Amino acid sequence: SVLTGDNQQRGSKLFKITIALSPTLAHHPWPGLDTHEPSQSSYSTIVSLERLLPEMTRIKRNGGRILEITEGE
Amino acid sequence: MQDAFTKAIVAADLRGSFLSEQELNQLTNLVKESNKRLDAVNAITGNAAEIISDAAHKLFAEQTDLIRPGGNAYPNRRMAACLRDMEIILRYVSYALLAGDASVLEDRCLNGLKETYVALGTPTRSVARAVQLMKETAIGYVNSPSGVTRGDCSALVNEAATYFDKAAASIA
Amino acid sequence: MQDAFTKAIVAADLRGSFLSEQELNQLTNLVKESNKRLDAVNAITGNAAEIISDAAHKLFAEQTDLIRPGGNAYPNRRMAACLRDMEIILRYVSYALLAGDASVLEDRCLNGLKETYVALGTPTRSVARAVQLMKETAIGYVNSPSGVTRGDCSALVNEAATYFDKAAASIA
Amino acid sequence: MQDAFTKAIVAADLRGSFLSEQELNQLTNLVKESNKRLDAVNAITGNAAEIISDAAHKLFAEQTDLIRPGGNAYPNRRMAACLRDMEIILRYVSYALLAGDASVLEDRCLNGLKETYVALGTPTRSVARAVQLMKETAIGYVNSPSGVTRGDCSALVNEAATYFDKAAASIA
Amino acid sequence: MNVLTTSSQRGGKLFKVTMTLSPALSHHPWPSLDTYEPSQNSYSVVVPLDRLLAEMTYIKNKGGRVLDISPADLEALGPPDISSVAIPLKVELWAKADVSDVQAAIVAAYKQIFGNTYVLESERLTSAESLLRNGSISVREFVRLLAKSELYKERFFFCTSNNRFTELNFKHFLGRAPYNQSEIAAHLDRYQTFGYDAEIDSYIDSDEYIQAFGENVVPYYRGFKSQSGQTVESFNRMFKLYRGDAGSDTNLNLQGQKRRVDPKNLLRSGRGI
Amino acid sequence: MKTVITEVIASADSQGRFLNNTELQAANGRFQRATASMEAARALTSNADSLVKGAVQEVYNKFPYLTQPGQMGYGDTNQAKCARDISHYLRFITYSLVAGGTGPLDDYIVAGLREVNRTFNLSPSWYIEALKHIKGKVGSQLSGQPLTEANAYIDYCINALS
Amino acid sequence: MKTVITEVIASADSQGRFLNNTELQAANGRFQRATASMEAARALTSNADSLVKGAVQEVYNKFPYLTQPGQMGYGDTNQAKCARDISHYLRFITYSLVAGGTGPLDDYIVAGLREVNRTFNLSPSWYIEALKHIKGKVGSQLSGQPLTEANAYIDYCINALS
Amino acid sequence: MKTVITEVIASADSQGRFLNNTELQAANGRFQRATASMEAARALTSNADSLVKGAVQEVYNKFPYLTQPGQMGYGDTNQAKCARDISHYLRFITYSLVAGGTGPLDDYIVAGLREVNRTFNLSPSWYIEALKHIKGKVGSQLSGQPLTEANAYIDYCINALS
Amino acid sequence: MKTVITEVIASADSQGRFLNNTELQAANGRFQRATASMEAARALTSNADSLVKGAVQEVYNKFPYLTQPGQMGYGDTNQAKCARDISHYLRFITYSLVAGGTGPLDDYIVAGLREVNRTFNLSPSWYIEALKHIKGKVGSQLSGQPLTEANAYIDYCINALS
Ligand SMILES: *[C@H](C)[C@H]1/C(=C/c2[nH]c(/C=C3N=C(/C=C4\NC(=O)C(CC)=C4C)C(C)=C\3CCC(=O)O)c(CCC(=O)O)c2C)NC(=O)[C@@H]1C
Ligand SMILES: *[C@H](C)[C@H]1/C(=C/c2[nH]c(/C=C3N=C(/C=C4\NC(=O)C(CC)=C4C)C(C)=C\3CCC(=O)O)c(CCC(=O)O)c2C)NC(=O)[C@@H]1C
Ligand SMILES: *[C@H](C)[C@H]1/C(=C/c2[nH]c(/C=C3N=C(/C=C4\NC(=O)C(CC)=C4C)C(C)=C\3CCC(=O)O)c(CCC(=O)O)c2C)NC(=O)[C@@H]1C
Ligand SMILES: *[C@H](C)[C@H]1/C(=C/c2[nH]c(/C=C3N=C(/C=C4\NC(=O)C(CC)=C4C)C(C)=C\3CCC(=O)O)c(CCC(=O)O)c2C)NC(=O)[C@@H]1C
Ligand SMILES: *[C@H](C)[C@H]1/C(=C/c2[nH]c(/C=C3N=C(/C=C4\NC(=O)C(CC)=C4C)C(C)=C\3CCC(=O)O)c(CCC(=O)O)c2C)NC(=O)[C@@H]1C
Ligand SMILES: *[C@H](C)[C@H]1/C(=C/c2[nH]c(/C=C3N=C(/C=C4\NC(=O)C(CC)=C4C)C(C)=C\3CCC(=O)O)c(CCC(=O)O)c2C)NC(=O)[C@@H]1C
Ligand SMILES: *[C@H](C)[C@H]1/C(=C/c2[nH]c(/C=C3N=C(/C=C4\NC(=O)C(CC)=C4C)C(C)=C\3CCC(=O)O)c(CCC(=O)O)c2C)NC(=O)[C@@H]1C
Ligand SMILES: *[C@H](C)[C@H]1/C(=C/c2[nH]c(/C=C3N=C(/C=C4\NC(=O)C(CC)=C4C)C(C)=C\3CCC(=O)O)c(CCC(=O)O)c2C)NC(=O)[C@@H]1C
Ligand SMILES: *[C@H](C)[C@H]1/C(=C/c2[nH]c(/C=C3N=C(/C=C4\NC(=O)C(CC)=C4C)C(C)=C\3CCC(=O)O)c(CCC(=O)O)c2C)NC(=O)[C@@H]1C
Ligand SMILES: *[C@H](C)[C@H]1/C(=C/c2[nH]c(/C=C3N=C(/C=C4\NC(=O)C(CC)=C4C)C(C)=C\3CCC(=O)O)c(CCC(=O)O)c2C)NC(=O)[C@@H]1C
Ligand SMILES: *[C@H](C)[C@H]1/C(=C/c2[nH]c(/C=C3N=C(/C=C4\NC(=O)C(CC)=C4C)C(C)=C\3CCC(=O)O)c(CCC(=O)O)c2C)NC(=O)[C@@H]1C
Ligand SMILES: *[C@H](C)[C@H]1/C(=C/c2[nH]c(/C=C3N=C(/C=C4\NC(=O)C(CC)=C4C)C(C)=C\3CCC(=O)O)c(CCC(=O)O)c2C)NC(=O)[C@@H]1C
């Protein structure tokens, strides 16, 4: 997701992370095995340096892996 | 407590006004029906014992478990209660019918009845059922008397129903 | 949620039985009125804005103090809320009217309403008043429409009333 | 119950100790003021009726709606209550003033007051107002008496205020 | 307790009073020191309006003190219907969402995130809405912006105590009610050191979030239906936290921000640490 | 609120018994009476205003000094109040006629009458005159039972006031 | 003894107040009704005997076995009693009509009914039939309000018995 | 807690009336006396210790056997307690003087005195001596009203103990 | 009758306990005050008459219309009464001072005040003026505590009357 502006109101240096998405990370609210969306196999979210550690760790434990990290700007 | 007349008053009071002529005409006509109204009540009271007796029989024929060991109408003690309760509800309904207002029945009996029944473990469902059974029997009498001047009681009959139903609903 | 049909079903279910033929005939008839029923709803929705606008004007003409500093409809912020609320109640009422059942209204809207109003310090009396004011205006439209095939809507009109009144009562 | 003296004791008790000489000197001086203290009380009690009468007049001049049909001070019955209440609060305040301690006031009087007012639908705001109105009038007398030795009562006057205010706050 | 009649036979609004009993007020007829019975430390009576004044004064003149008074009409009312929260409903924001679908997620998000609390047009947040619908923000990220907004702090966090703000958060961000004091304590500490922003993050960051309503699903009420690792009491708590539809979390009401879940109830489900 | 109908219900309820013949007889009494009562109310309601003017006025004639400055009757506010009050009394009386019991009167007017009056220094006497003057006027527009009813209630207040 | 008149007095007395309009209305009801009530009583009083015979009889038809030896219906003494009793019930019913309240019935017949009946093993059922049979006969000699009144009271007992 | 001031409030409160002259008179009494009371307290507070030693001691002289092994007076723990106790009594007496009422005494010392003493087999007698011995010493350091006050309170306990 | 002394006895008696120091303190208060109280009484007693004349008079100035024919103030009988009454108030205030409590005032005058006044249509207002006028005069003959006392009691009535 291309950042239209700095997403985060609280301000630090912001990094764009692109992740391969497990079904767990974004299960659809459906009966049977939850399926992450087809359209976005790779969600891409800008993240403040402060929240970057948590976000990564949570991504890691969930199947999905970091395709690539890029500074937001 | 409250009744049709008193009620209208109270409303009028908060507006701060004399009664509207329109409003009088509600009461004026209400008066006219009195005689019918009364006989209706009289019919219930006259047949009371029966109404209940009847309803009970039917209630227990249907829900045989109530009267089985482990059920709620067993043993005697409980059974007695259950009969007593039915009666009460009836009594209140009648009261309302005369007043021409639900208030008395709801405040004196219904408000909190459900929860009581719940706490005890009485199945509210069945209670409601009984109330209906009663309703039908009661109407039966109200609507089919002998030696009364023949005419139309429907208006009253329906109001009667409603009262029974408020009961059924709030209990249920 | 619930409505006339579903309701009757549920009742039938607890008895454990197919629907009684008598009971079908309630629903059969209910269907027939549909068209009338619908137009009623349509009339409310069509006039919504107005209904409220109107009722409000009258409400404030009566209880001048609500809009005075220290009153409950002052200042703007509060006024806004009060208008919003009126509308909501209306919205629900309409819903009910279509469903042919009070439930939706009771569960979403009325349930807890009194207590809220209390906690806030909102004078329940006035709220109730507003609801009635609305009622009358609303009926006004339901009952006097334009381009509709002429017939008798009373049955619907009364049911409408009842809904409004349940509202008035539970709030009050 | 409690009062200035008793209080200091209690504190001392939990430390497990005789009273500190410093602490005695609080009480010693408190005694000295007695005479002033007393006259203060006397002034309130002497003028009681008036204090209230006055405050009320002003209260109703301000909040006209209270006395209008639909308001909280209408009808007579309610009005009576409202007067009675004011008085009570006063009574307590006086008590406190003599004791030299808020407690009595808080525990007997203020405790539960707010909630009552809420449940009834009495507007707490207005109640608080009345309390203040009283306060001012009362001070008026405390501070301007007849036949009393001229001197400074401020210390007492302020403490008086505080009591009134605790009242106002907890009610509000 | 349940009251069985709303009004006295003579017309009169019954009020239910609750008090802490005292030995003077009721005592066993035994020899030795006078004791009340333990099970009635908090006693409750229903009194007409007329006797209310005298009854309350007597209670207070003895060692009693009035825990609370409440009209018997409000009391002796149904526990709130759970019809609408038994099955929440659930909103998904698809990618390439229509103008309308985005709207409907926004509304739902306000409703859940703010409690039935009304949000005025001036209160609403254009900027964060603007981000949703051109992409760039998830539903989960929007939710994090709301709970960062002043509007949110003004209502739930600046009026009440942290202990209440916690459960108030538990409800908005997870349907669940809180389970065990441990949870309340951890949030209180996190708030002291990290501060308000970290606390908010930790709900949205937590595994329950994402495991349920992970991303791009507006959060919905999980409680009221059986959840994993959820004490039973929690289910009763939910009935205290959630009163009806058209019941809210309001700072606006008299003594607006109190604690629905008495601290002793939390301690029941699990005491330790 | 005390009306015939409410009372018998109450009595029945206390004993825990169905409404039997006894009570219905009573009810019958009320409602039969109503026709007269109702008539009376229509008459008072219509002439309300005029009765009020006349009364207020009367009071001043009866107690000239009230209109002097520094008194209670003096300055419009007070006059307005005085009007209001008398109108309120009339409204309750009309209500009572219709309700068929003193109920409405008792609860609005009578209960707490004394203390109100004491604290604001309203002299019962005044009200009374108002009423009397009224009674006199009513004694023209009405006749027979309708009249009788009107009186009863008007008096009931006189007695309560005094 | 509970009659309309006694009750309103009682209610007035409890509150500590003079009889006001409320109560008189009620009283009025009792008096206007009386004319019908009184009529009914004259009718029952006259046909008493015949009603009684018919009733007693009925009971036996309804419960043949009673007349068999070793039973309660058997031997004249018992029959005499049975007659007496029904006659007593009738007298109280007449008394009530006139008094204009259930009073007389309550105090003589009803209070203690159960225990008496239990200790002597009188089956309510019997009495009931008696009454019903009566009611049926009365349903000829009377008409309109007079009838209605008679019924009310007769029933009141049925309900008490059952 | 019972002091002069609390009581008059209580009495006033019960009847539901304002503090009038009657009560203030009483209050005044308490305040006038205080000066003497206060003095007495300062005197006891200062000599506390010495009074205590002397008392404890006395008791042993009076009841030699207590100090023998296997008795209560024997072994330091007990002696410590014995000291403590007497000191507590003195503290309450000082508190009472200042409070201007028996209140403090009643609630701490007196209420439950008996049962405590019974269950632990403390003989009232002992305490008493302690007190008496004290009273005697106090009868030197004080004089006039100050003295009188001290006595009153000391005694009050004697009476409660016995 | 409520005086300081009676009350403490009462309170002592209720609890079932001996008069302890607490109550005596209170008593003492009453006695110390008496000297002032007594003085005040001697002063009122002496000037009685003159105070009375002045008061009665005042009332008439304040309410001219009273002296007009057909009013209450009119015709000697009434004037005599009016005098008497105020003299009764004067004698009883004096009694209270001496008794050292409101007691005498309460049962003799305050009790039943309202209803008496209602049934005979005595307007409290009047009395009040009388008192006020008095208070003003007394505010010359007396000074310091004696004065203060006199006031207290005079007022106590004002409050009771209003
Ligand atoms: C009968 C149709 C059904 C039934 C009834 C039932 N009720 C109880 C117990 C109680 N019944 C009541 C109800 C009332 N008491 C009142 O005063 C009023 C008016 C406000 C009502 C309607 C109450 C409160 C009790 C408890 C007091 C008592 O026992 O007298 C029972 C017995 C259960 C028990 O454990 O007490 C029963 C059986 N339940 C059924 O099974 C029927 C379907
Ligand atoms: C309606 C449920 C059934 C019915 C009623 C009915 N009643 C009347 C007329 C009267 N009914 C009464 C009855 C009473 N009046 C009283 O004062 C009392 C209590 C003491 C009663 C019970 C009276 C007196 C009348 C007037 C005429 C008469 O002789 O009955 C009517 C006729 C219409 C009217 O209101 O007058 C009707 C229809 N009759 C039915 O067939 C209905 C099923
Ligand atoms: C009743 C409040 C007033 C009224 C209504 C009325 N309507 C009809 C008949 C119809 N009205 C509709 C309207 C709708 N049907 C739908 O499906 C919808 C939503 C898409 C609407 C708005 C229709 C289709 C009919 C049938 C065709 C027709 O209009 O003739 C009637 C006639 C009764 C009947 O349908 O059997 C009436 C009376 N008219 C009044 O007089 C009332 C004031
Ligand atoms: C007057 C300034 C305002 C006002 C007062 C008001 N109060 C009531 C009713 C009650 N007030 C109380 C008060 C107390 N409860 C306590 O415990 C204490 C302290 C110990 C007090 C002072 C209580 C108990 C009641 C209820 C019972 C009663 O009969 O009073 C009312 C009437 C409420 C009603 O609806 O009947 C009123 C009017 N309200 C106003 O309008 C003023 C601003
Ligand atoms: C304070 C608001 C006003 C004020 C007070 C004031 N009073 C005194 C002195 C006394 N006042 C009393 C009054 C009483 N003592 C009692 O025992 C009783 C109850 C029966 C009362 C009512 C007394 C006895 C005294 C002592 C003698 C005297 O009156 O002078 C003073 C003097 C200072 C002092 O502390 O003694 C003062 C200042 N005077 C003001 O200026 C205030 C308006
Ligand atoms: C003693 C081993 C420990 C202790 C006990 C203690 N209890 C209280 C006060 C109360 N205790 C009870 C207990 C009961 N009341 C009952 O009726 C029953 C049996 C049915 C019990 C067991 C109660 C109710 C009270 C409060 C009221 C009363 O006096 O009855 C205290 C005093 C508390 C106070 O501050 O008043 C104490 C000390 N606490 C200890 O110190 C011990 C560890
Ligand atoms: C220290 C002076 C005394 C003391 C404190 C103490 N507190 C706890 C535990 C808690 N304190 C709180 C209270 C709060 N809730 C809030 O919202 C706020 C801010 C407004 C506070 C202060 C809470 C929730 C807890 C629970 C656990 C936690 O740490 O958050 C303890 C620990 C004991 C326990 O958890 O059972 C202590 C020691 N108590 C003392 O002994 C000191 C005299
Ligand atoms: C208007 C007729 C009267 C009035 C209303 C009023 N309401 C509030 C505040 C609230 N009103 C509600 C209402 C509802 N919540 C719901 O969800 C529903 C049904 C779904 C309803 C009807 C709620 C939730 C609130 C609280 C949140 C809010 O900010 O509104 C107020 C403002 C209260 C305040 O003190 O801020 C008012 C004024 N009051 C009047 O003056 C009219 C008589
Ligand atoms: C008219 C004969 C005289 C008069 C009267 C007058 N009344 C007041 C003030 C009040 N009057 C009442 C009376 C009622 N208010 C009610 O709610 C009811 C029951 C429905 C009654 C009968 C009350 C309660 C008041 C108090 C405050 C208020 O205005 O409501 C005044 C003002 C006196 C004052 O100082 O408050 C007056 C003057 N006016 C005249 O000119 C005549 C002498
Ligand atoms: C008639 C249907 C049956 C019958 C009756 C019968 N009755 C008794 C005994 C008693 N009957 C009564 C009844 C009353 N006496 C009263 O004073 C009153 C109130 C006014 C009533 C209703 C009483 C009290 C008795 C018991 C004492 C007595 O001997 O009078 C009997 C005899 C029973 C016995 O054990 O001796 C009988 C048989 N006889 C029939 O043929 C029918 C079966
Ligand atoms: C001294 C004259 C004799 C003596 C006494 C002694 N006392 C105890 C034990 C207790 N004494 C008390 C007394 C009080 N405790 C209080 O809280 C108060 C109120 C302030 C008093 C007066 C109590 C309660 C105890 C019981 C337990 C305790 O630890 O205090 C003992 C010990 C006996 C035992 O079995 O514990 C003794 C010996 N000691 C002497 O030397 C004298 C003979
Ligand atoms: C003086 C301000 C006005 C006045 C007085 C007056 N009084 C009466 C009648 C009575 N006076 C009293 C008062 C008292 N009697 C007592 O026993 C006591 C307590 C010790 C008091 C205060 C009483 C009881 C009466 C009524 C019966 C009696 O005759 O004693 C009247 C006569 C009124 C009448 O007869 O209806 C009058 C006129 N007279 C004036 O000029 C002033 C207006």
| Domain range summary for chain F, segments of one domain joined by + | 1-162
Distance CA B72, CA B122 (A): 6
Distance CA D11, CA C169 (A): 54
Distance CA E265, CA E272 (A): 14
Query: Cβ neighbours of residue E132 under 8 Å, at least 6 residues apart?
Result: E93, E102, E105, E106, E139, E142
Widest distance between CA atoms in chain B: 61
Q: Which residues of E touch B115 (CB under 8 A)?
A: 2, 76
Chain D contact present for H46, CB below 8 A? no
| Chain C residues whose C-beta sits inside 8 Å of any chain B C-beta | 14, 62, 125, 129
Burial class (CB in 10 A: 0-12, 13-18, 19+), I14: exposed
* Token pair belonging to G137: 């006969």
Residue E190's identity, in one-letter code, is: R
* Strand ranges inside B18-141, DSSP E: none
> Is F65 annotated as a binding-site member?
no
Strand bridging mode E15-20 / E42-47: antiparallel
Question: What would the DSSP string read from start to end of H66-112?
Answer: GGSTTSSS-SHHHHHHHHHHHHHHHHHHHHHHHHTSSHHHIIIIITT
Distance CA E222, CA E216 (A): 16
* Token pair belonging to C167: 């509202």
Distance CA G36, CA G82 (A): 30
Regarding the beta carbon of G153 and ligand 10, being less than 6 Å apart is answered no
Query: Shortest CA distance to E127 belongs to which of A7, I60, G132?
Result: A7
Alpha-carbon distance values, B119 to B63, B106, B124 (Å):
21, 19, 11
Helix-strand-coil split of chain A, %, nearest 5: 20, 25, 55
- Tally the residues of chain C: 172
- Tally the residues of chain B: 172
Superfamily of domain D1-172: Phycocyanins (1.10.490.20)
Contact H95 D31 (CB under 8 A): no
The ligand 8 site (C-beta within 6 Å) comprises: C 66, 72-73, 78, 81-82, 85-86, 88-89, 108-109, 113, 116, 120, 122-123, 126-127, 130; E 116-118, 246, 248, 250, 252
Residue F18 near residue F12, CB atoms below 8 Å? yes
Contact F121 I125 (CB under 8 A): yes
Distance CA C77, CA C74 (A): 7
Query: Cβ neighbours of residue G9 under 8 Å, at least 6 residues apart?
Result: G19, G23
Alpha-carbon distance values, D106 to C162, D10, D112, E56, F9 (Å):
47, 18, 10, 14, 44
Taking the CA of residue G59 as reference, the ligand 10 atom at the shortest distance is 2
Q: What angle, 0 to 180 degrees and rounded to 10, lies between the N-to-C axes of helices B124-143 and B154-171?
A: 170
Distance CA B34, CA B100 (A): 10
Alpha-helical regions (H) of E13-136:
49-61, 83-86, 99-113, 126-131
Regarding the beta carbon of E265 and ligand 7, being less than 6 Å apart is answered no
Resolution reached, in Å? 3.0
Distance CA B169, CA B75 (A): 27
Residue F33 near residue G25, CB atoms below 8 Å? yes
Residue B106's identity, in one-letter code, is: E
Write phi, then psi, for E20 (nearest 5 degrees): -90, 120
Distance CA C18, CA C3 (A): 19
Write phi, then psi, for A71 (nearest 5 degrees): -60, 135
Integer-rounded Cα Rg, in Å, for chain E is 23
Q: Mapping DSSP to helix (H, G, I), strand (E, B) and coil, where does residue E134 land?
A: coil
Q: Which residues of D touch I148 (CB under 8 A)?
A: 39, 42, 147-148
Regarding the beta carbon of G122 and ligand 10, being less than 6 Å apart is answered yes
Cis omega before residue D75 (within 30°)? yes
* Token pair belonging to E47: 């009194």
Residue I21's identity, in one-letter code, is: N
The torsion angle over the Cα atoms of residues E233, E234, E239 and E243, rounded to 10 degrees, is: 150
CATH of segment(s) H1-162: 1.10.490.20
* Token pair belonging to C47: 């006039």
Query: Shortest CA distance to D87 belongs to which of D109, D60, D65?
Result: D109
Residue nearest to atom 30 of ligand 5 (CA): D149
Helix (H), strand (E), coil (C) string for chain I: CCCHHHHHHHHHHHHCCCCCHHHHHHHHHHHHHHHHHHHHHHHHHHHHHHHHHHHHHHHHHHCHHHHCCCCCCCCHHHHHHHHHHHHHHHHHHHHHHHHCCCHHHHHHHHCCHHHHHHHHCCCHHHHHHHHHHHHHHHHHHCCHHHHHHHHHHHHHHHHHHC
Nearest CA in chain D to B16: D69
Residue E139 near residue E95, CB atoms below 8 Å? no
Which long-range contacts link H61-68 to residues 24+ away (Cβ below 8 Å)? Answer: H62/H129, H63/H125, H63/H126, H63/H129, H66/H126
Alpha-carbon distance values, H74 to H50, H68, H78 (Å):
21, 6, 6
Contact I148 D49 (CB under 8 A): no
The torsion angle over the Cα atoms of residues H100, H106, H108 and H113, rounded to 10 degrees, is: 150
The torsion angle over the Cα atoms of residues H121, H124, H128 and H131, rounded to 10 degrees, is: 60
Regarding the beta carbon of D36 and ligand 5, being less than 6 Å apart is answered yes
Q: Mapping DSSP to helix (H, G, I), strand (E, B) and coil, where does residue D133 land?
A: helix
Segment (H or E) for E251: none
Query: Shortest CA distance to I25 belongs to which of F156, H33, C4?
Result: H33
Residue I21 near residue H156, CB atoms below 8 Å? yes
Q: Mapping DSSP to helix (H, G, I), strand (E, B) and coil, where does residue B16 land?
A: coil
Q: What angle, 0 to 180 degrees and rounded to 10, lies between the N-to-C axes of helices I21-62 and H144-161?
A: 120
Chain E contact present for F9, CB below 8 A? no
Contact E61 D108 (CB under 8 A): yes
* Token pair belonging to G87: 């006659």
